[model samples]
Target chain A: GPSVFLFPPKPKDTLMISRTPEVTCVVVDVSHEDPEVKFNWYVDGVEVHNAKTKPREEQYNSTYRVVSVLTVLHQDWLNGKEYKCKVSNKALPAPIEKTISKAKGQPREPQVYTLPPSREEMTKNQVSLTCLVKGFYPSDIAVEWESNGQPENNYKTTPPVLDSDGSFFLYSKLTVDKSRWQQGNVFSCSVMHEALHNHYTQKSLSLS
Target chain B: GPSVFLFPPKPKDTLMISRTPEVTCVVVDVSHEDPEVKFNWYVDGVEVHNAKTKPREEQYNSTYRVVSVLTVLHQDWLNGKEYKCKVSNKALPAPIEKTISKAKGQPREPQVYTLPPSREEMTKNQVSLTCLVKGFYPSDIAVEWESNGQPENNYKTTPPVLDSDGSFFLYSKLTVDKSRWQQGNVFSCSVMHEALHNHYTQKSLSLSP
Candidate 1:
């Protein structure tokens, strides 16, 4: 009779980011009785320097890794721009905030679709190919069916899945062989994640 | 410089599985300083029960709780099950093992996925869809794109990739507004995550391009 003790409560949104052109790591896990754990490395709000802190061995260890380097000296103002890794720990009896989003070595700027006009009058055995891609985020994405660009293996993935924050929307499907879609083969849909760095607040949304 | 007091080291794979349902809770801090404490429970491999026999809660206060329930009148005779839980206190002495997978009421079974296709048939104008969903765990997932079923404004995502064992593959994208693609719509692609038993291992794939 009378015997119940449950202890399971320690999850403040674990976050860890890593990038390497030279350096860019942000690992965080605050609140160990508080005592002081202030780490700030903003890029759009400006506030990044030597930037390197450590004090995590293992005590419910949540994970905190912070590293930044592109060449220092402001490094061309963070090149592609956009960075955020704020954290505060006073000893948690109070004061504790968290944010992690900073990754961009480059290579993520492609989204152009304008194929209609019946697809330029398909002639070689009728054709119809559609491959669309949009912004990126933590949505595990992929779509490939390339021939000359190499990636053909048949593919499909679509749903009302769309997130980076617009809140869900994803759809994919490829049925091409119709003579390689009229010999225009080169289908592709790549939206890989973990490459953050393109700040445009107010939550912009327009990838038509 | 001797005010160093560290705690946390008492949990090394505990097991217990006898009659059945088991619960063991023990707490003793009294603030700290050799506050003597010991509680153990086990099944399968025997050890009946141990807690210094029972009765001992004084001296700054050292709480304790142990609840056990096992009832079986022959279910293929036990069926290879293990249960265990142990804890000892002595200022900071160590011996802690607690690993009880399931033993409270026993009734857990739910996980499925299959929804990777729907419909697509508009060529040249625009028609190529795919939505595959599969198995769900801690991986919170989502995929959506509906047309004649109405529900498509502009959405696409893929970047929360994880495989070594985490298991998660998500995607999203829908674009076919060529004047409504010659009025031939009936597109649907939906797959949501987090369902250990409601059913959703997910799979769905459509084609037209």
Candidate 2:
């Protein structure tokens, strides 16, 4: 099985206007055995090449590994042009290509919801709390549960859920004892998402 | 830009024993290219070729779209072996390779939790419900909320979260209006996971207190 991936995964950051105009390079890796592979670079659907554009091949355990690097101007990439690396090998029915372009938009803040137990259930020792955070982006977020203003380590949190729109959602749960429920203790859930900067979203539930 | 992808994106299932022993094939598609590229197939760590292994190239819109297929036996795949397809062209720094193998273990049932509203909060017109379903495998599950025994759609749900342990977690929320809360209506969160086998997990809450 052969795999291909681009460096910097997301190429849009390289086109940021704040960055000084410089040469940006992207590499394509194809791991297999075959020295006769050919490589081509294209910009905006047009074939182009530069001095830095070249292919390097090596031998690995009786198989050949090839890599091609395509260098271009950051300004050209920011000009809303698309970049592609095309590869050809005699073992393939045709050529294989990969492309990269700019990314749009920033991450969004997640919506937080808390679920608390009713007074009767609390007295019956059947109280459990839940916090749900949804509609965030980047899929990197941390969720923590707190009881009585102290961090509660004995809690379960679901892995981050990635939405169809690229946003994310998370869930956390904590069980409370009958004594604590009667004592009017505070239960809070706090969330930290990349888009929130250094701030956090906290939701609390308690019996007044 | 051009792209290359393997058929049956997750190659793990191709090695399953449930499927009858037949020709197991993997296809590599490199679309938008020049015809001069090459492709190779390897079994385990060594490169091997047979009559069924070959590369087929075609041209579309002046760009070459190539496909390479490697065929073998189901028994060979089940024999705890690894298979990889390698592709190379003058434009790449290194050859691209993809590998496939068998999946391990079966899906597990999800644990479900429901969070209801507090007594004071329910009376103050700030009532809502939440459900957390976690610890399931395969990451594909359906969660919904029901009010007074009827399905409720005015809710929000999170995409399935994949856990580090190859399990999944999901969350869903529903808001209850003052009318429903005052009437002592029942709310339930139900889940359906692959491991449930025609059954589901449902947790309910009400103003019984």
Candidate 3:
């Protein structure tokens, strides 16, 4: 169950033009800390022998986070070229592969919406708030609920549902007691996706 | 990144018929080892509260390998019911989910074949051995090449290619110098897949007896 990822993720329709020499690093990060993790680099379908690899470590409470960076020239990453970093570990059923293409389109930010509870439902001392995220690619997204500035832990979420256009849709619902709902607390749904780049998209609602 | 997996994998077309009460375990395994990792279990779309969560860890060199197991009951696993496990972690952009159905089908073994070097190509002091594995489900497969009883490392392999039928296809090729391709030297391609269950399907070719 090794998780492999690529850093400085390639954006959609990204083009690089350089009259002189340039270089960039396309890092291949693995979540699992294994001494035997082997990394192989390929450019435009052919393996490269001169790529440099460096291992980095970070402490996270009881476990350590490990990453490997692979450096390549910017000229080699021109249009129509594909770069791949393949990783192998014993815990993995197969070698995890991460590939980037200069021409590959970037992931679009998700469209966020909410379905608030009805007036009658709220009067019954029960409230249900549903958040929907649609039209996102690569399937890596996080949705969270906050009430009165405090994170709510109890909720229900659906699996990433695939759409006809190759994007994904996810739904999460937060239910609260009617007493808490009548307190006029503000509720917010925050979405975090790679496309947002360190910021999150949020929508808030409050009882009048 | 978040990884979600299920244990005691559902078998193909499994049927349960028991008048007496029984109990069984359906474990959900997640790869992330953090306090923020949360697990939720559901039966037939309704959340269940009887499941227990346990954290297990193992040290792999410098990094720690951690997993959480959720236990369920056997009586709840009827033929027409559905089971699901959902996991959430702060490090993940989104929650990871895994689902299983009692009536789902099991995976079948892969179909393996090899393309040997031609007689003319073998005589020219060069040999290329190609192995192809097709029609396997779950995509947990490994293909290795051995030359003269030794494991060969220098080779090319393609990632598991998806087929239209939900199965996978993988290709591996091994090239050797003509001088090492002597008579009686054997080359073997071994395939290890989950469906095979401790057995490997291998094909071997030799120049001469």
Which one wins on DockQ? 2
- Whose lDDT is higher: candidate 1's or candidate 3's? 3
Tens-place lDDT per residue, model 2, B46-103, is 8876624345545555555656555556556544467776767655567677776544
After superposing candidate 1 on the true structure, give the runs of residues whose Cα lies further than 4 Å from its correct spot: A1-75, A78-104, A112-208, B1-92, B98-202
How should the candidates be ordered by TM-score, best one leading? 2, 3, 1
Among all windows of 10 consecutive residues in model 3 chain B, the one with the lowest summed lDDT is B12-21
Q: Write the per-residue lDDT of candidate 3 for residues B97-135, one digit (tens) a residue.
A: 777654344666776655554343455554655565666
Report per-candidate DockQ. 0.06, 0.16, 0.01
lDDT of 2 by residue, A145-178 (tens): 8876789765677677554446666677676776
Residue by residue across A1-208, what tens digits does model 3's lDDT show? 5456665333221222222321223322334455356777777888876645555454454233445554455436533467777877666667777776543455776766665554434455546665656668656556889876789865555556665456666656576777766778778888876556443677876666
lDDT of 1: 0.37
Chain B: TM-scores of all predictions: 0.24, 0.47, 0.49
Better of 2 and 3 by TM-score: 2
The alpha-carbon deviation from the true structure for residue B135 of candidate 2, after best TM-score superposition, in angstroms, is 3.6
Report the CA-based lDDT of candidate 2 relative to the real structure: 0.60
Model 2, residue B98: C-alpha shift (Å): 24
**Model 1 CAPRI quality:** incorrect
Give the per-residue Cα lDDT of candidate 2 at B127.
Answer: 57
Higher-ranked by lDDT: 1 or 2 = 2
TM-score, B chain, candidate 3? 0.49
> Which candidate's lDDT is highest?
2
